[PDB]
Amino acid sequence: SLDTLAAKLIEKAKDLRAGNSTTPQQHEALVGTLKQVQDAVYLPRDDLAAMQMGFVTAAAIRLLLHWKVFEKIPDTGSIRYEELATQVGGDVVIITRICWLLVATGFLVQEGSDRVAHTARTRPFAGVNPLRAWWLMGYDEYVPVLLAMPRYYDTYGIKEPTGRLHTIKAFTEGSPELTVGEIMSRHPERTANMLISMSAMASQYPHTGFYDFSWVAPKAAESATRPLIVDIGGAKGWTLQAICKETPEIPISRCVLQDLSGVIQMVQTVGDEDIRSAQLMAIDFHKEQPVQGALVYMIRRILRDFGDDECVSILQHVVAAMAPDSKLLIADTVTGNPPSWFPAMLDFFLSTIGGKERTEEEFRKITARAGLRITGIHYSDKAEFAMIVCEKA
Amino acid sequence: SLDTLAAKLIEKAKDLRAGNSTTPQQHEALVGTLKQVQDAVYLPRDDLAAMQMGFVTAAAIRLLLHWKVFEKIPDTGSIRYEELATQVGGDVVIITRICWLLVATGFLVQEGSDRVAHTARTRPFAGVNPLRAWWLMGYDEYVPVLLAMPRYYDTYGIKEPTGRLHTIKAFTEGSPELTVGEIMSRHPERTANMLISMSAMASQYPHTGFYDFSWVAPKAAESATRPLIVDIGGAKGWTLQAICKETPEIPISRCVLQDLSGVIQMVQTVGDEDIRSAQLMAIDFHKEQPVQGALVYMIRRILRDFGDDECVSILQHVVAAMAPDSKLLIADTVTGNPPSWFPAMLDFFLSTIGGKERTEEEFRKITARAGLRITGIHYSDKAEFAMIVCEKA
Numbered sequence A, B: 001s002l003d004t005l006a007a008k009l010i011e012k013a014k015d016l017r018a019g020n021s022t023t024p025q026q027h028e029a030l031v032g033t034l035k036q037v038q039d040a041v042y043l044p045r046d047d048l049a050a051m052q053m054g055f056v057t058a059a060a061i062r063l064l065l066h067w068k069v070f071e072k073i074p075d076t077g078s079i080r081y082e083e084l085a086t087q088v089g090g091d092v093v094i095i096t097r098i099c100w101l102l103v104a105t106g107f108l109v110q111e112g113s114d115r116v117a118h119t120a121r122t123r124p125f126a127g128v129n130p131l132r133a134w135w136l137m138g139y140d141e142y143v144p145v146l147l148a149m150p151r152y153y154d155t156y157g158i159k160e161p162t163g164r165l166h167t168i169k170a171f172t173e174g175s176p177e178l179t180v181g182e183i184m185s186r187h188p189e190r191t192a193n194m195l196i197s198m199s200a201m202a203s204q205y206p207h208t209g210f211y212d213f214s215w216v217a218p219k220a221a222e223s224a225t226r227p228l229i230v231d232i233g234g235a236k237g238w239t240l241q242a243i244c245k246e247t248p249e250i251p252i253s254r255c256v257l258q259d260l261s262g263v264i265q266m267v268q269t270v271g272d273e274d275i276r277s278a279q280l281m282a283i284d285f286h287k288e289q290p291v292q293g294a295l296v297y298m299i300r301r302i303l304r305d306f307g308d309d310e311c312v313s314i315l316q317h318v319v320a321a322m323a324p325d326s327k328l329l330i331a332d333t334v335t336g337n338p339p340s341w342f343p344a345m346l347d348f349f350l351s352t353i354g355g356k357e358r359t360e361e362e363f364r365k366i367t368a369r370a371g372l373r374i375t376g377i378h379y380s381d382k383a384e385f386a387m388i389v390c391e392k393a
């Protein structure tokens, strides 16, 4: 309510004066309560005006990023608009107007009518880091594709976009005959920025803590030979390291990390010693699963990027390699009907590359097509992200 | 401070509880306080989530508009996703995914496992009205222009855009040699949406309530042929109709509605019998004011669209047409420096068409340059909007 929002501000204010730390939980609660109140108080005209303001604050930030203006505002203190203008080599009038939008929305602050300064909300824009890279990737790589969606669906029909080709992204780029990866390989600066972005999203879903892997331990004791955990598209092997740290009775030396040649090579070169002890293998999971009869095959945050038919192709290569008692673990969001806001947002972005966040029913359908049955779903505490346990039907 | 904000929330909650928070000024003030809270508490991760969710929610709304889904969701009650999908001839899965994004953000409501319903936030999209037209103007006609701003300033220099040609909007449209008004006026559906959008956001741009025209009624008796009010760039004459409703002694047949050829012709189609009984007239106010000697020349929300020199040029043509007892009335947004929240948003948008929001002193400098004397400024008590009353100096 308005009053509980006021209570949370009074609390924050006292804890700052007392120099104590706002927890992530208290911050979330404060922001959540603000949102509840705005949703109760704002009329439709307020909702839509706030949305349009969002467009222009993002454009203003983008334009100042383009002009390298955030780099020139000092970390603390302030800089005269005229000095900014001289250092950019542009007109002080337009630079000041752009800054004023950000002052009116609390991104920047003025110190006297002549000078501008950062807030905590703009310091990430003053240099290279993952939030800024992620911000630029979303704005430059996705916003034009979102604008292109009505034209896309006019062209292809009102149909779920499910292919690796003719994605909304590739359509927007002008090369629908290419995959998104092929398009990005033609764009080295955009890829570089994306690589930094890519690291941030991976870090924010849990690798362990919500599923018991220790049942692999007795098999490792019975069999000296059977491969234990195969991580398909495991990247730099962070998941395998986390599992074997959590349960040291699972020898990482009997696990298998599969990815692209370039990623495996970087693991072999600068990967830590535990992961380098695992069996590393370059594969194409669209065409093959080379490890036969492993106890566990894991597919983490991969199926969300593909349509059903492509997921069933990946899955069936694994099922052909599975022994009768193998498990196939899919780590991915099992979205609700209806979904919560963060997976619902991710799903909307995934539609531009042919993927989606599936419901439990949708996962049942694709695993059954691959000859699997889901025997358990173990949810983490983060936005319906779950371990889906599958065995041969 | 967090504490003064908390106290403002607490006091507005009291007013609501007693039934004493009725007025538009009170609503606007509470909305402003909530925005101040947002700005004081949001951190980069919150701003990023809000940017992403804003763009995604906008594109979802745009697709459901384009597909005529909002029109098919009943005003109350609910409809099955499968019925919606069949009525728009679309795939139920992609339609559901997109509705689900709006369900997750409280724009739509899902009933059970498979039905969807309007909220007050989406009913504006279910049919033709000014708020919907305003939203479509912003999204269709300005968001793609926002994305073009980096390239525009790389093309023309980091300089305040002040010309009526080669605006950012005409640059994006691919017709730099047309003014933005000419571009809007050449396509019927764009023109018709523009006309309806000029009736939106009366909370910022009231059409009456702040200036009393009743002094015109007398002079209507002085003569039978003299034009009483000339509405320069008057769109579809909504403001003339508002004035004549409130001063029924001013006959609308003695008023002149002037706009571009394409706009004034559309008034034959959409205007009611009342406005179509006015003197409709195509003009180009960059070049001429063809009606000499009128009692009042009204220039409402025109000067905002142009730079200072072009505004002087426009006013000079009107001054030449004026008789010694004529008045020239400028009706427009009048803000402070820096601009308040809503005019700060508009100032940024107006930069893409060569315009800006202005302070009272900025309007005074333009009117002086055009050889006018201001005899009165009459502010709205609900919006930063005023009638500037002028005569020949």
Ligand SMILES: C[C@@H]1C=C[C@@H]2CCCC[C@@H]2[C@H]1C(=O)c1c(O)c([C@]2(O)CC[C@H](O)[C@@H]3O[C@@H]32)c[nH]c1=O
Pocket: A052, B134, B135, B137, B138, B139, B141, B142, B180, B181, B182, B184, B194, B301, B304, B305, B346, B349, B350, B353
């Ligand atoms: C330009 C401005 C863009 C963003 C704001 C917020 C989002 C809703 C649209 C609204 C819009 C608006 O308020 C105005 C506006 O639409 C125009 C024009 O599009 C540009 C000139 C044409 O001759 C015709 O008059 C229409 C001129 N002047 C304005 O003030």
Ligand SMILES: C[S@@+](CC[C@H](N)C(=O)[O-])C[C@H]1O[C@@H](n2cnc3c(N)ncnc32)[C@H](O)[C@@H]1O
Pocket: A202, A232, A233, A234, A235, A236, A239, A258, A259, A260, A263, A283, A284, A285, A286, A299, A300, A301, A302
């Ligand atoms: C979404 S990313 C990270 C997935 C990883 N399981 C995780 O949770 O962090 C997908 C990974 O799959 C890899 N990959 C993409 N295509 C592949 C292919 N055809 N064969 C093998 N690996 C692939 C990428 O190199 C990337 O490391």
Ligand SMILES: C[S@@+](CC[C@H](N)C(=O)[O-])C[C@H]1O[C@@H](n2cnc3c(N)ncnc32)[C@H](O)[C@@H]1O
Pocket: B179, B181, B182, B185, B198, B199, B232, B233, B234, B235, B236, B239, B258, B259, B260, B263, B283, B284, B285, B286, B300, B301, B302, B305
């Ligand atoms: C921002 S709208 C304001 C409309 C109306 N006076 C109001 O306030 O609701 C700008 C108006 O000026 C008209 N316009 C633009 N350029 C014009 C021109 N060169 N000559 C005549 N009208 C023009 C547009 O077609 C549009 O109706």
